[PDB]
């Protein structure tokens, strides 16, 4: 659900700053990872694709070929409150996007294209949070 995705996003986003330099991702492109979900944030930059690889690697969410590791992703998602309601759909949805971009061999570019597809399909399927839901989790600390 969108509520569960708010919790996943809020945690996953903590590795933005440590990944920023190696990804070449300007603060001007993305200042805080929660804005990935803004209606009018365009998910396009190769650097954001590099960042997402870097951030995923932190939680072993990539397989040897820089695609989603399905098992590790499922285990990560279920580590959040009610995570089991989202885990099957989210993997299925991401993997469907990956198949559509399998002919992009540049890893950063492939991953940003996959991210954009995942964002758009997440809205269609009802698992996209609003920024405010993401902030509400972050703000509990
Ligand atoms: C992905 C788990 C963190 C939650 C929200 C973050 C979304 C931004 C990344 C888009 C999809 C990432 C999945 C890796 C794509 C593999 O090709
Ligand atoms: Mg490769």
DSSP one-letter string for the chain: -HHHHHHHHHHHGGGHHHHHHHHT--TTT-SSGGGGG-TT-----HHHHHHHHHHHHHTT-B-TTSSB-HHHHHHHHHTSTTTHHHHHHHHHHHHHHHHHTTT---HHHHHHHHHHHHHHHHHHHT-PPPHHHHHHHHTT-
Angle between helices 16-23 and 46-58 (to 10 degrees): 130
* Number of structural domains in the chain: 1
Q: What is the whole-number distance in angstroms between the Cα of residue 111 and the centre of ligand 2?
A: 11
Q: Which domain holds residue 61?
A: 1-141
Cβ atoms of 55 and 90 within 8 Å: the answer is no
Q: Measured from the CB, is residue 98 less than 6 Å from ligand 1?
A: yes
**Cβ-based neighbours of 60, under 8 Å, separated by 6 or more:** 69, 72
Give whole-number Cα distances, 48 to 45, 54, 102, 141, in Å. 5, 10, 18, 26
Q: What is the whole-number distance in angstroms between the Cα of residue 140 and the centre of ligand 1?
A: 23
Q: What is the whole-number distance in angstroms between the Cα of residue 52 and the centre of ligand 1?
A: 7
Torsion from C-alpha of 36, 34, 107, 91, nearest 10 degrees: -90
Among 103, 94, 54, CA closest to 74: 94
- CA triple 26-30-34, angle to 5 deg: 150
Q: Measured from the CB, is residue 80 less than 6 Å from ligand 1?
A: no
Q: Which of 5, 12, 79, 106 to mutate to test the pocket of ligand 1 (most atoms within 8 A of CB)?
A: 12
Where on the phi/psi map is residue 135: left (φ > 0), alpha (ψ -120 to 50), or beta?
A: alpha
Ligand 1 atom with minimal separation from the 110 CA: 17
Among 50, 11, 54, 53, CA closest to 33: 11
CATH for 57:
1.10.238.20
Cβ atoms of 74 and 5 within 8 Å: the answer is no
Q: How was this structure determined?
A: X-ray
Q: What is the whole-number distance in angstroms between the Cα of residue 108 and the centre of ligand 2?
A: 10
Angle between helices 70-78 and 2-12 (to 10 degrees): 100
- CA triple 133-21-75, angle to 5 deg: 45
Among 73, 70, 60, 65, CA closest to 8: 73
């Amino acid at each position: 659900t969108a509520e569960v995705m708010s919790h996943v996003t809020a945690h996953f986003g903590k590795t933005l700053e440590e990944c920023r330099e190696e990804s070449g991702l300007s603060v001007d492109i993305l200042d805080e990872f929660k804005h990935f979900w803004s209606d009018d944030f365009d998910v396009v930059h190769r650097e954001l694709g590099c960042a997402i690889i870097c951030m995923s690697n932190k939680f072993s969410l990539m397989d040897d070929d820089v695609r989603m590791h399905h098992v590790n992703m499922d285990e990560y998602i279920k580590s959040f409150p009610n995570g089991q309601v989202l885990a099957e759909k989210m993997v299925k949805l991401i993997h469907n996007c990956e198949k559509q971009f399998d002919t992009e061999t540049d890893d950063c570019t492939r991953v940003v294209k996959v991210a954009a597809c995942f964002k758009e399909d997440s809205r269609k399927e009802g698992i996209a949070p609003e920024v405010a839901m993401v902030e509400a989790v972050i703000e509990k600390y």
